[PDB]
């Protein structure tokens, strides 16, 4: 099996906790996801972070198995996880799709956005149902960042995490890209934290980018 180097390192679990991945799943629950653990008395179910990291490493193993990098195509329609996907497509040789999905992007072969990949990564099944339906129509696996409340129809291996955080999605994409690059071998050893930062995959509202520019242009 996987060598014990692939266990849940203290810093990586600690990061997962800090981004409040476990904190929120839902006040409700669907029996497709047993990744629940110790439903909090606040009525906010806790997510088993170890199971989440196991799903992350499984998804990394699946992605690394693809011989040609740009048949891994990652979707994000909701704002909170747009930038991260682009950033992911920067490091791993994946193809990003942000904002709208222009339906018919998988079945219709005439559209100039017609990409025929071998794997699809989805930030949220409930928002990206169109991509899931296209992948169904064209026989494509769907590694979706499913929450404990998102539906799991036409959804393959599903990373259980938060979808309302603006922190969880970016860091989940970080761990995914980091593990994929370790698997490929571009990153030499899987112990150093890969200096570039989790905040790189975080969301950036235009109002705060304007504020940051104003603070940068003050001097």
């Amino acid at each position: 099996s996987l060598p014990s180097t692939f266990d849940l390192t203290s810093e990586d679990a600690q990061l997962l906790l800090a981004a409040r991945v476990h904190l929120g799943a839902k006040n409700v629950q669907v029996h497709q996801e047993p990744y629940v653990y110790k439903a909090r008395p606040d009525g906010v179910n806790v997510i088993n972070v170890g199971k989440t990291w196991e799903k992350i490493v499984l998804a990394a193993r699946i992605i690394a198995a693809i011989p040609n990098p740009e048949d891994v195509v990652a979707i994000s329609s909701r704002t909170y996880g747009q930038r991260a996907v682009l950033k992911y497509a920067a490091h791993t040789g994946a193809t990003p799709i942000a904002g709208r999905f222009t339906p018919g992007s998988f079945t219709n072969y005439i559209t100039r956005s017609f990409k025929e990949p071998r794997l699809v990564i989805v930030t949220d099944p409930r928002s990206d149902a169109q991509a899931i339906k296209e992948s169904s129509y064209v026989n494509i696996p769907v590694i979706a960042l499913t929450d404990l409340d998102s539906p799991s129809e036409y959804v393959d291996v599903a990373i259980p995490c938060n979808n309302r955080g603006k922190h969880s999605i970016g860091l989940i994409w970080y761990l995914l890209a980091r593990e994929v690059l370790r698997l490929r071998g571009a990153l030499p050893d899987r112990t150093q934290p890969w200096a570039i930062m989790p905040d790189l995959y975080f969301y950036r509202n235009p109002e705060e980018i304007e504020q940051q520019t104003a603070e940068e242009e003050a001097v």
Binding site: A13, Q14, L15, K38, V44, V46, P198
Partner: protein, 130 residues
């Protein structure tokens, strides 16, 4: 009833997206640019194209707008995107290396067999009436 149909709008959009450094705020200079950099058959269409180009340029000067893009704007967007804060926003950089949890995720950490310095706090299971 002036609506400036497909042709003028698309031509002006392409004109901006390919020639922003040369376009100006003035209608007459942009009219001459439309004459020299593009082969508009008639001259009424040329004037309409230059007018909408000036309007779009003024809108861009006011701020960034949807649809159209050019080298300078996309470079600025990429540079703003590459912003990564030097100070850490995780790993308990705040709250004196202490992060607050409840019992349940504390037992999660315990059963995971990891040390993970925590701070317990009951969540007052009484829910807000909203």
């Amino acid at each position: 009833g002036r609506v400036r149909t497909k042709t003028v709008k698309r031509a002006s959009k392409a004109l901006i997206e390919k020639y922003y450094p040369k376009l100006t705020m003035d209608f007459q200079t942009n009219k001459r640019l439309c004459d020299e950099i593009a082969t508009i058959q008639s001259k009424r269409l040329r004037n309409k194209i230059a007018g909408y180009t000036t309007h779009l340029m003024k809108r861009i000067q006011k701020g960034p707008v949807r649809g159209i893009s050019f080298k300078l704007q996309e470079e600025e967007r990429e540079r703003k995107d590459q912003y990564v804060p030097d100070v850490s926003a995780l790993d308990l950089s705040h709250s004196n290396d202490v992060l607050n949890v409840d019992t349940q995720t504390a037992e999660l950490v315990n059963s995971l067999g990891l040390k993970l310095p925590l701070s317990v706090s009951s969540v007052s299971a009484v829910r807000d009436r909203r």
